[PDB]
C-alpha cells in the first residue's frame, strides 16, 4: 500500500519497542541506585497502567478532535518521555517518564487504529488486524534487542535512540498524515471468554518471565545486559520463525486448543528443568528454550481470536490489545514482589500459572465435547 500505512505501522512498532526498551538496561539502572526488585517491575507496570488508562481517553480525544493531531501529539509526548528518561537520577523522575510514555502510547494506539480503519477497504480488515498483531508482537520481541545493542557504549544512549526515532516518526507523520439497544448485546460473553483468558495468561506469564530473567541473571550470574537482551531476542526470533515457517505442519496434525495446551505443558516442564538449572550455559540454554514456547503461543491465540470474531475483527483487536496490556501490568508488580520475597517464587508462580492455563484449556475442550 501507500507509505501512509508504513508510517502508521512504524508509529506502533516504535511504541512497543519503547515498551520493551527498559527491561535489558533495567538491572544496572536500579542497581546503581540500589533498588529492590519491586520498583524494577513497577517501572514497566506503571507504563502499562498508563497505557491502558489512557487508551479509552485517547480514543475519545482522537474521535472528538481528529486523528492526525492526536497522533502527532502522542509522538511528541513519547519522544519527550524517551529523552527525559535518559536524563533521570532518581526513581520518581523515572517512574514519571515511564507514565508519560505510557499515556503517549495509549493515546497514540487508538488514533492509529482508527486511521487504518478509515483508510483501509472493508475487505482488508481481518488482514490488517493480522499485520497489526504481527507488528505489535515484533515490537515486543525487538525492544530489548535495540536496548542491549547500544546499552554497551553507554547506559543513556538507547533512550537517545528512542527519542530520535520518535522525533523522526513525528516529522514523517506531520508531512504525510492527512484527514478525510443491540450495540453491546452482540457479544454473548460466552464465546470470547476462553481466548480472552488465554491471551491474558500468555501475556502475564511472558511479561513476568521477561522481568524475572534479567533480575535472576544480575543477582546470580552478575552479567551485562548485552547477552541478556541477545538471549531474549534470540528466543523471540527462534519462536516466531519456527511458527511462521512450520505452521503448515502444525495445523496438519494439531488443533488450536491442543497446540496452545501442549505449548504450556512444554513451557512448564522446561521451567521445571530451569529450577534444576544453575550453570551459566545451562541457564542460558534453558532460558532460550523457555522463550520459544511463550513466543509461539501468541500466533495461535490471535488466529483463534480472528477465527472466533469472523466479521468483528476490530473488536477482536481491541480486546486482544486491552488484555495484553492487562497482562503486561499485572505481571511485573507481582514478579518484583516475589523476587523480593524469594528468588524462585516467581518461577513457582509461573509454573502454577501455566498449569492453570492448561486446566483452563482442558475445561474448554471438555465443554466443547459436551
Amino acid at each position: 500500500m501507500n507509505k501512509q500505512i508504513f508510517v502508521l505501522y512504524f508509529n506502533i512498532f516504535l511504541i512497543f519497542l519503547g515498551i520493551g526498551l527498559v527491561i535489558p538496561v533495567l538491572p544496572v539502572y536500579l542497581k546503581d541506585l540500589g533498588l529492590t526488585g519491586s520498583d524494577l517491575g513497577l517501572l514497566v507496570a506503571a507504563f502499562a497502567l498508563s497505557q491502558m488508562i489512557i487508551s479509552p481517553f485517547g480514543g475519545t480525544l482522537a474521535d472528538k478532535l481528529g486523528k492526525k493531531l492526536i497522533i502527532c501529539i502522542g509522538l511528541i509526548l513519547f519522544s519527550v518521555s524517551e529523552f527525559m528518561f535518559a536524563v533521570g537520577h532518581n526513581f520518581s523522575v523515572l517512574m514519571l517518564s515511564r507514565v508519560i510514555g505510557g499515556m503517549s502510547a495509549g493515546m497514540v494506539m487508538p488514533g492509529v487504529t482508527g486511521l487504518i480503519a478509515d483508510i483501509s477497504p472493508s475487505h482488508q480488515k481481518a488482514k490488517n488486524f493480522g499485520y497489526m498483531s504481527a507488528i505489535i508482537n515484533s515490537g515486543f520481541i525487538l525492544g530489548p534487542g535495540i536496548g542491549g545493542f547500544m546499552a554497551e557504549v553507554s547506559h543513556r544512549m538507547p533512550f537517545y535512540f528512542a527519542g530520535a526515532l520518535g522525533i523522526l516518526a513525528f516529522i514523517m507523520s506531520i508531512v504525510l498524515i492527512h484527514d478525510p439497544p443491540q450495540l453491546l448485546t452482540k457479544i454473548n460473553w460466552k464465546v470470547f471468554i476462553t481466548p480472552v483468558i488465554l491471551t491474558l495468561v500468555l501475556s502475564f506469564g511472558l511479561s513476568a518471565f521477561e522481568t524475572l530473567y534479567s533480575l535472576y541473571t544480575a543477582d546470580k550470574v552478575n552479567y551485562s545486559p548485552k547477552d541478556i537482551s541477545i538471549a531474549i531476542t534470540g528466543g523471540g526470533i527462534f519462536g516466531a520463525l519456527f511458527q511462521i515457517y512450520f505452521f503448515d505442519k502444525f495445523m496438519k496434525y494439531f488443533s488450536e486448543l491442543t497446540f496452545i495446551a501442549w505449548s504450556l505443558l512444554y513451557s512448564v516442564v522446561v521451567l521445571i528443568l530451569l529450577v534444576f538449572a544453575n550453570d551459566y550455559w545451562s541457564i542460558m540454554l534453558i532460558s532460550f528454550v523457555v522463550f520459544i514456547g511463550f513466543n509461539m503461543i501468541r500466533p495461535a491465540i490471535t488466529n483463534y481470536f480472528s477465527n472466533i470474531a469472523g466479521e468483528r475483527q476490530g473488536f477482536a483487536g481491541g480486546l486482544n490489545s486491552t488484555f495484553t496490556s492487562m497482562g503486561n501490568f499485572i505481571g511485573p508488580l507481582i514478579a518484583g514482589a516475589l523476587f523480593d520475597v524469594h528468588i524462585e517464587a516467581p518461577i513457582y508462580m509461573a509454573i502454577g500459572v501455566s498449569l492453570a492455563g492448561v486446566v483452563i484449556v482442558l475445561i474448554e475442550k471438555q465443554h466443547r465435547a459436551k
Partner: antibody, heavy 128, light 105 residues
Framework: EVQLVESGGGLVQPGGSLRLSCAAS????????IHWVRQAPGKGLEWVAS????????SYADSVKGRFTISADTSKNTAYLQMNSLRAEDTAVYYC???????????????????????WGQGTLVTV | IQMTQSPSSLSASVGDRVTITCRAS??????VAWYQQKPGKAPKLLIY???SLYSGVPSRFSGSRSGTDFTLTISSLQPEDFATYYC?????????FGQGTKVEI
Amino acid sequence: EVQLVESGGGLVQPGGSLRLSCAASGFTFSSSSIHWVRQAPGKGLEWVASISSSSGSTSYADSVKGRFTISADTSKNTAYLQMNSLRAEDTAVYYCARMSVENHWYYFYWYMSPYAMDYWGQGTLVTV
Amino acid sequence: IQMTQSPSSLSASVGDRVTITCRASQSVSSAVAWYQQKPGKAPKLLIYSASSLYSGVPSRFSGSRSGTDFTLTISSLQPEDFATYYCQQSSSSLITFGQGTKVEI
C-alpha cells in the same frame, strides 16, 4: 441542506455508452460512499455499484461484474458511472444514494457506522 | 446471497397490524435495512439495523430478527403508508435487495 442531483440518461443506442453522474451537496463526500441502484419499470430494486471515497474500494453486483465502471472525483464532489454496454435488461430508472461510512470510537475498539442508504436523489431514466 | 421476501402483495385496511418477512440464507449479522418507496419517487430509509429507527420516521414502524427471518412490523397503519417496502442486507461489499411488498390500501 443535503441534496443529490444526477445528470445523463435518455435514449441510448444498444451497446453504446453514457456517463451517468451524481452531484453531491450538503455532506462530506470524503466521509461517505455513493452507491447506485436500479429500478426496472414495474419491478424491484437491485444494487448496481458502490464506491467508497475514504478508501477507494469499489464493488459491483454479480450480474454487472465487469461491465459498468464507477468512479468519484473528490474535487467537485461528483460520482461517475460509466456505461460501456447497454441492452434490454439495462433499461430502468437509476437512483443515486449515499452510504455513511465513518468509524466511531467506543472505548477500546472502533465500530463502523450502521449500514444505511440515507439520502436519495430523484433518479434519471435510461431507455433502450 | 439471495433473500426471499414473503409475501409479494399484501392488501390491508387502515389501523391494522402488518408484518413482512425477508429471510436471509446466511444470517449471522444484523445488517438489514428496509425502504419505503412511493410510485414515481425515490425510496426513503425506514430501518437501518435489526430493530433501530431512523430519525424522521414514524415510531409505529419497527424491526426484529429471529435466527434468519427479519420482520418489519407496522403496528398502526395510515393512508400515507400506501407504498412498496423492500428489504436489503449489506453484510458484505455486495448488496442485494428483496423482491418487494406492494401493499394495496
